[PDB]
Amino acid sequence: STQYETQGYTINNAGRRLVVDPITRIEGHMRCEVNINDQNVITNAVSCGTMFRGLEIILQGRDPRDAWAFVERICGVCTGVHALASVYAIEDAIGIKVPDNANIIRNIMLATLWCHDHLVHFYQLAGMDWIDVLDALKADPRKTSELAQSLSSWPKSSPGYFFDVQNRLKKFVEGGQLGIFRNGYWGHPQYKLPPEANLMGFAHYLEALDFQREIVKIHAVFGGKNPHPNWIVGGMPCAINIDESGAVGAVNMERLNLVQSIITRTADFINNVMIPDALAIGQFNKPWSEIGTGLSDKCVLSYGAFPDIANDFGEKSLLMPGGAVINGDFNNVLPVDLVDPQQVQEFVDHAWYRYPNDQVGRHPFDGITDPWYNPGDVKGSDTNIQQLNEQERYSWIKAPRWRGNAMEVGPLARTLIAYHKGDAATVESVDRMMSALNLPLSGIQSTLGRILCRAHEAQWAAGKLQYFFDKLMTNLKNGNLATASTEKWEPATWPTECRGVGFTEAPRGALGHWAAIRDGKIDLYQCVVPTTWNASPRDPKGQIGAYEAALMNTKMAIPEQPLEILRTLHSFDPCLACSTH
């Protein structure tokens, strides 16, 4: 057993080893291992992506116009975000400028995704870490009504409603078929909600499972379907016709009316169900504002997103700020350049990939994706891993670094970047939110903080949805209908050789696609995805990524039941298919 120091942590693989495989209530396949000391405190944490598909290999030789459709299938949870990054990358490479309405509709597609994804994460993925569903059976329906009405104006609060929800759960359990609730962590001492808050939470779990289906109707109108809507290089294919023959065949006033109706309902659900629930989880779990800090007080990264000026990806255009903090210096938000070879690099010394020199990091334009399953000296065998060997290669996830630094990405990262750049809305949201909880600002740099920032981002995005929709309608009032530029649709118009970067802020953090086009075909296509950053394995210096760092130093009440590990991992919203692609 060895010990070394990195980023303020003492990585120590003495003591009991615990394995959580599978990690559930995530997208895709993850394994996590830890070592705990004699006080049941984590002294070593190992993040492992347990899947790979090889989209970067598959994309070679494809028509650049087709690329979005392939890379969209990196992920059905963050569905659309990879299509957006792809059309951005291809447009950047060829030099295509899209019409304003295409840009606005793309922003609507992204905002819609932020709302949907964040909502489903809060309830269906992270929720059962905080809500003791089975304890809801002990709640008083009237006291549940009282609690709900104390927290929100949301209509659905009657005693009889909560009784009906409770009764439905009771009869469900009575069947002796607990389904998705079977063999959970119910009764664990870290469940702190009173029964009434558990019943309220569970009711909201169900309401959110229902409501989330409506949000993506916006994707259906502009993009055909959800999951996996359609896009084009040059804009969007959803041609607009308001006042001419054949408007029945296009985005018309009736289609726009449907979109408006969904926007209003989406804002209302998020503002009156999710936001109060997140604050309530905060109130009953304040100690988790001091757990799972990880890299969030050290190194955070955002590329920025939502260009409000069409075809302008600069700081004055992006509504979601970009920037990097390193060394815990939040007074110096540094600019990010995705073409600079000394900035974003990926290492594979601790990953299942071949490089000519695994001691160096490769910028994505020099990226290599050559799979090499070699887990080394595991406890077990190559096909029966009892314990990964984190001293060697232990993941299908590459290790991204920014100027050699290990970074956290995602809602909390974005909140901290915007806050420290002096975004007024963000400072106000964060101050008021932490005030309501009677916690210091530093409490946001935590597992609880990740959850609170995500919730607030859903509110932010629901607001932006209306703003974008209103900008679309303003263009239509002015007779500006264009949704595609076709000037450079034909391969004959393209440079023989060119390369481009497409970047955005996906629900889980900073996303980039790096594309090289040669002779009308994809020559290279490299993706670095938010969960790649967060779930990263170690690098040649032994530096740990965001997950490993957040898990370090964490107390477990009951080693056999990994509730604390789940809480922290889930707070990052892991997307493993994304991470590996």
Partner 1 sequence: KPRIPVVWIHGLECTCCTESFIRSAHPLAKDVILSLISLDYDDTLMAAAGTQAEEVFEDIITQYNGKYILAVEGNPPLGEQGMFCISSGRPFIEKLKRAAAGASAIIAWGTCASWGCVQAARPNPTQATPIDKVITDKPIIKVPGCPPIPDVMSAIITYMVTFDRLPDVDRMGRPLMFYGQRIHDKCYRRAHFDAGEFVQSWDDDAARKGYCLYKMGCKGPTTYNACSSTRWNDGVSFPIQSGHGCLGCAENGFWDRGSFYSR
Give the residues across from 524 on adjacent strands: 516
453 marked as part of a ligand binding site:
no
Q: What is the DSSP letter of 289?
A: G
Residue 131 corresponds to which amino acid? I
Q: How far is the CB of 479 from ligand SF3 (least distance, A)?
A: 33
578 marked as part of a ligand binding site:
yes
> What's the rounded Cα separation, in Å, for the pair 111 and 22?
31
> What's the rounded Cα separation, in Å, for the pair 211 and 196?
22
Segment contacting Ni ion by CB under 5 A, of 29-37, 54-62, 386-394, 573-581? 573-581
Report what 530 binds from partner 1, ligand SF3, ligand FCO, none; CB cut-off 5-8 Å by kind: ligand FCO
Please state whether 533 falls in left (phi above 0), alpha (psi between -120 and 50) or beta: alpha
Closest CA to 91 of 345, 303, 312: 312
Rg (CA), the chain: 24
511 to 550, contacts with Mg ion by CB under 5 A? 527
Order across the sheet with 42-49: list the strands: 16-20, 30-36, 42-49
Q: What SS3 state is found at 3?
A: strand
Please name the residue that has the structure tokens 């981002």.
457
What six digits make up the tokens of 264?
């209003």
Q: How far is the CB of 576 from ligand FCO (least distance, A)?
A: 8
Residue 128 touches Mg ion, criterion: CB under 5 A? no
Over the window 78 to 117, marking each residue x when it contacts ligand FCO by CB under 6 A and - when it does not, the resulting string is x--x------------------------------------
- Sorted by sequence, the CB contacts under 8 Å of residue 418 that are 6+ apart come out as 302, 320, 321, 426
- For residues 260 and 269, the answer to whether their CB atoms sit within 8 Å is no
Among 93, 119, 120, 148, binds a copy of itself (CB under 8 A): 148
Among 23, 67, 78, 551, binds Ni ion (CB under 5 A): 78
559 to 578, contacts with partner 1 by CB under 8 A? 560-562, 566, 577
Among 36, 42, 45, 74, binds partner 1 (CB under 8 A): 74
The residue (of 82 and 538) whose beta carbon lies closer to ligand SF3 is 82
Residue 508 touches ligand FCO, criterion: CB under 6 A? yes
How many angstroms separate the first and last alpha carbons of the chain?
33
Residue 73 touches ligand SF3, criterion: CB under 6 A? yes
- For residues 233 and 90, the answer to whether their CB atoms sit within 8 Å is yes
Among 47, 345, 446, 531, binds ligand FCO (CB under 6 A): 531
The residue (of 55 and 417) whose beta carbon lies closer to ligand SF3 is 55
Helix axes 195-215, 159-174, angle to 10 degrees: 90
- For residues 185 and 131, the answer to whether their CB atoms sit within 8 Å is no
575 marked as part of a ligand binding site:
yes
Segment contacting ligand FCO by CB under 6 A, of 295-303, 447-455, 481-489, 571-579? 571-579
Report what 159 binds from a copy of itself, ligand SF3, Ni ion, none; CB cut-off 5-8 Å by kind: a copy of itself
Cis amide leading into 227 (omega within 30): yes
The residue (of 448 and 578) whose beta carbon lies closer to ligand SF3 is 578
Torsion sign, CA atoms 153, 156, 159, 163: negative
Residue 93 touches Mg ion, criterion: CB under 5 A? no
The residue (of 154 and 467) whose beta carbon lies closer to a copy of itself is 154
Among 25, 66, 159, 181, binds a copy of itself (CB under 8 A): 159
Over the window 74 to 113, marking each residue x when it contacts ligand SF3 by CB under 6 A and - when it does not, the resulting string is --x-------------------------------------
> What's the rounded Cα separation, in Å, for the pair 399 and 402?
10
Q: What is the DSSP letter of 224?
A: S
The residue (of 77 and 208) whose beta carbon lies closer to ligand SF3 is 77
The residue (of 447 and 531) whose beta carbon lies closer to Mg ion is 531
Q: How far is the CB of 577 from ligand SF3 (least distance, A)?
A: 8
Q: How far is the CB of 376 from partner 1 (least distance, A)?
A: 13
Among 154, 161, 163, 185, binds partner 1 (CB under 8 A): 185
Closest CA to 49 of 492, 373, 333: 373
> What's the rounded Cα separation, in Å, for the pair 439 and 279?
12
Binding site for a copy of itself (CB under 8 A): 145, 148-149, 152-161, 163-164
Binding residues for Ni(2+): 75, 78, 575, 578
Site for ligand SF3, rule CB under 6 A: 73, 76
Annotated binding site: 75, 78, 575, 578
